[PDB]
Write a protein that binds this ligand. Structure first.
Ligand SMILES: Cc1cc2nc3c(=O)[nH]c(=O)nc-3n(C[C@H](O)[C@H](O)[C@H](O)COP(=O)(O)O)c2cc1C
Ligand SMILES: Cc1cc2nc3c(=O)[nH]c(=O)nc-3n(C[C@H](O)[C@H](O)[C@H](O)COP(=O)(O)O)c2cc1C
Ligand SMILES: O=C(O)c1[nH]c(=O)[nH]c(=O)c1CCc1ccc(Oc2ccccc2)cc1
Ligand SMILES: O=C(O)c1[nH]c(=O)[nH]c(=O)c1CCc1ccc(Oc2ccccc2)cc1
Lengths: 313, 313
C-alpha cells in the first residue's frame, strides 16, 4: 500500500505538493518544501524582472478559504533558474518551475534558457495561463485566441514536455473549447486545475470594509469555497484530454479532499490555502489521512481509483 | 425599526425574497411564499410549454451549500401568467415573474403577452440570461453580442421597465463588457447578481459517486460556496450601473450575509439554497438579525449603508 507515482519520467513518493504561490517564493521557502514530506514542489510563478507585487494587505484567510491579489511578487527568473540549476536537491524530490510572463515574448525568453536545465536536471515547467494580457482583456486562459498563441510560441521555444496552470471554467462550451486548444499541443503533457476563483470579494461585517487593499478588495479565492468547482475542472479535463495528465488543485484540506480529487482523475494533488494556513506539517497528515481512506476501502494504489468516479445510471 | 422600502414604484415590507427556482413552481408554493414574511416573491423561470425537467436526483444540499441541474422544470408560462393575473394577492407583497425561454423568439412571444398584465396588475419581469444559446456557444450572458440581441428584442417586445438575472463573472474585463451591454438598455432598471456558479461537481467520498444524476454529476453551485462570488458581482455591477438597481443573490444564511450584500450595493436580497433547506420561516429570522445588526451599529435605514463598503484607500 503506497502513495507512489511514476509520471513524466519522474518518480514521486506521494501525489502531494504545494500550489504555485504558497511556500515557494524564496530559497528559504523552497528549501522548507524540499525538507517536507511532499512528493514534489513548484516555485512561485515568476517574471523576467523581480517584482515586489501589490500593497499589503494582499492575502487574507478565513474558516472557509482565502482571498488574494498578490500581483506576482517574485524573485524573478534568474533566481528561480539558478535554484533549479544549482541549489535544489533532486535526490529529495522533483522540482516544478512556474512561469507567468506578462506577454508572449517574456515567457518565450524564459523557456528558451530554461530548456537546457530541464533537459540536464529534470526541472519541469508549469506555464501559468492566468498570466495577464493587455489590460482590459481577460487573462490568457479566458481568451482562447491568445491562449493558442502563447502555447504555439512556448512549444516552438521550449520543445520539451511541459504543463499548464488553468483557471476554472463554468460553462460546458468553455471546457469544450479549452480542452480543444490544449489538445492541439502534444508537448502539453499535464494540466493543473484550478487556479484561484477569479475576483471574489470578501467583506468584513464589523468594519464594513474589504479585507485586502489592492483592486478595491477584489481577488482570487482558494480553500473550501472552491473544491467543487475544482473537481469539475479536474474531471472535465480528465475526460476531454486522454493523452494528458491532470493535476488537481482546489480546496484540499484532508486526505478525503485529496481522495475526491484523485477520483475525478487527478495525478498530483496541490495544496494552496491549507498549506499557507497549517504549514508544511500538513503533508504528513494528508498522506496519513488518504492512506487510512484507501485501507478502509481496500485500495492498494492510486491508479485503482484515479479517474474512477461513478455516475448515476 | 423596520426595513420597508420602495423600488420600481412598489412598496416592500423588507428587502427579502426567494430566489427564482426555490419554493415558487406550484400554485401551492407561491401561496406559501406569499404567506411568508418575505417582502416579495418570484416564480420559477419558465418556458412557453410546460417542462418536466431532468432525472432526479437533480438537487442536493450539504453544509457548505447546494448543487442542482433541474432542467427548468416548470408549469409553463400560461400557468404563471394566470397566477400573475388571476391568483396573486398584490396587497400582500409584489410579484416578480422569471422567464428563461429557449430562444429569443420564445422569450419575445412571452413578454408581448406579459406586458399587458404588467401594465394592469404590476407584475415585474426578471429575465433569465442563463437561458440557452445557439450550438457550440456558452449561455447567453457569457456571449455578449447574443446578450445585446436578447435585450434589443425583449425591450422592443416588452417596452416597460424590467430586470435581468445574471450569472457570475470572474474577470474585471467581463464586468466591464457585461455592464456596458446592460447600460445600452434603459428599460433594464434592476440587475440580479448572481445566478448559481455554473458547473460545479460534488463527489461523495464513501460511494465514490457523483450526487446528482444529469450531466454526469455537474451542476450549479449555491450556498456558502458562492458568497464571495455574489458580493464581488453585486458590487461590480452596482458601481458600473449607477442608473440601475442591484438585487443580490447567493450565500444568504443570515442577517449578516444580508447586511454585507446590502453593503455591496444590493437593494433586494434574494434567498435560495438557505430557503430550500430551512423553509420560509427563515424570513422572520433574517429580518430580526438584520434589524439587530443595524441597531448595534446605529443604522435606521438601508439607504444609510447601501453600497457603502469601505475600501482600503
Ligand atoms: C497567496 C497565493 C498565491 C498564489 N500564487 C500563485 C502563483 O504565483 N502562480 C499560480 O499559478 N497560482 C497561484 N495561486 C493559486 C493557487 O495555486 C491555487 O490554485 C488556488 O489558491 C486554489 O487552491 P487552494 O484552494 O488550495 O488555495 C496562489 C494562491 C494564493 C492563495
Ligand atoms: C433548486 C434550484 C432551482 C433554481 N431555479 C432557478 C430558476 O428557475 N431560475 C433562476 O434564475 N435561478 C434559479 N436558481 C438559482 C437561484 O435563483 C440562485 O441564483 C442560486 O440558488 C444562488 O443563491 P443561493 O446562494 O441562495 O443558492 C435555482 C437554484 C436552485 C438551488
Ligand atoms: O500572484 C498573484 O497575484 C496570483 N494569485 C493567484 O491566485 N493566482 C495567480 O496565478 C497569481 C499570479 C498570476 C497573476 C496575478 C496577478 C497579476 O497582476 C498583474 C501584474 C502585471 C500586469 C497585470 C496584472 C499577475 C499575475
Ligand atoms: O432550473 C435550473 O436547472 C436552473 N438552475 C440554476 O441554478 N440556475 C438557473 O437559472 C436554472 C434554470 C436555467 C436553466 C437551466 C438549465 C437549462 O437546461 C437546458 C434545457 C434545454 C436546452 C439546454 C439546456 C435551461 C435553463
Amino acid at each position: 500500500m503506497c502513495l507512489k507515482l511514476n509520471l513524466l519520467d519522474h518518480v514521486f513518493a506521494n501525489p502531494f505538493m504545494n500550489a504555485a504561490g504558497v511556500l515557494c517564493s524564496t530559497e528559504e521557502d523552497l528549501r522548507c518544501m524540499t525538507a517536507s514530506s511532499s512528493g514534489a514542489l513548484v516555485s512561485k510563478s515568476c517574471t523576467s524582472a523581480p517584482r515586489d507585487g501589490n500593497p499589503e494587505p494582499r492575502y487574507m484567510a478565513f474558516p472557509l478559504g482565502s482571498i488574494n491579489s498578490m500581483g506576482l511578487p517574485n524573485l524573478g527568473f534568474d533566481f528561480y533558474l539558478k535554484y533549479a540549476s544549482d541549489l535544489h536537491d533532486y535526490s529529495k524530490k522533483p522540482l516544478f518551475l512556474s512561469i507567468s510572463g506578462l506577454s508572449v515574448e517574456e515567457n518565450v525568453a524564459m523557456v528558451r534558457r530554461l530548456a537546457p536545465v530541464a533537459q540536464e536536471k529534470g526541472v519541469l515547467l508549469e506555464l501559468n495561463l492566468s498570466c495577464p494580457n493587455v489590460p482590459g482583456k481577460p487573462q490568457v486562459a479566458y481568451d482562447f485566441e491568445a491562449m493558442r498563441t502563447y502555447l504555439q510560441q512556448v512549444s516552438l521555444a521550449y520543445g520539451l514536455p511541459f504543463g499548464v496552470k488553468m483557471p476554472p471554467y463554468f460553462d460546458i462550451a468553455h471546457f469544450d473549447t479549452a480542452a480543444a486548444v490544449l489538445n492541439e499541443f502534444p508537448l502539453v503533457k499535464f494540466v493543473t486545475c484550478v487556479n484561484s476563483v477569479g475576483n471574489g470579494l470578501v467583506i468584513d461585517a464589523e468594519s464594513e470594509s474589504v479585507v485586502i487593499k489592492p483592486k478595491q478588495g477584489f481577488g482570487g479565492l482558494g480553500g473550501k469555497y472552491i473544491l467543487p468547482t475544482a473537481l469539475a475542472n479536474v474531471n472535465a479535463f480528465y475526460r476531454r484530454c486522454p493523452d494528458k495528465l491532470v493535476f488537481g488543485c482546489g480546496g484540499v484540506y484532508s486526505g478525503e479532499d485529496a481522495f475526491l480529487h484523485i477520483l475525478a482523475g487527478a495525478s498530483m494533488v496541490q495544496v494552496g490555502t491549507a498549506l499557507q494556513e497549517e504549514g508544511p506539517g500538513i503533508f504528513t497528515r494528508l498522506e496519513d489521512e488518504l492512506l487510512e481512506i484507501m485501507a478502509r476501502k481496500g485500495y492498494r494504489t492510486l491508479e485503482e481509483f484515479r479517474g474512477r468516479v461513478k455516475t448515476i445510471e
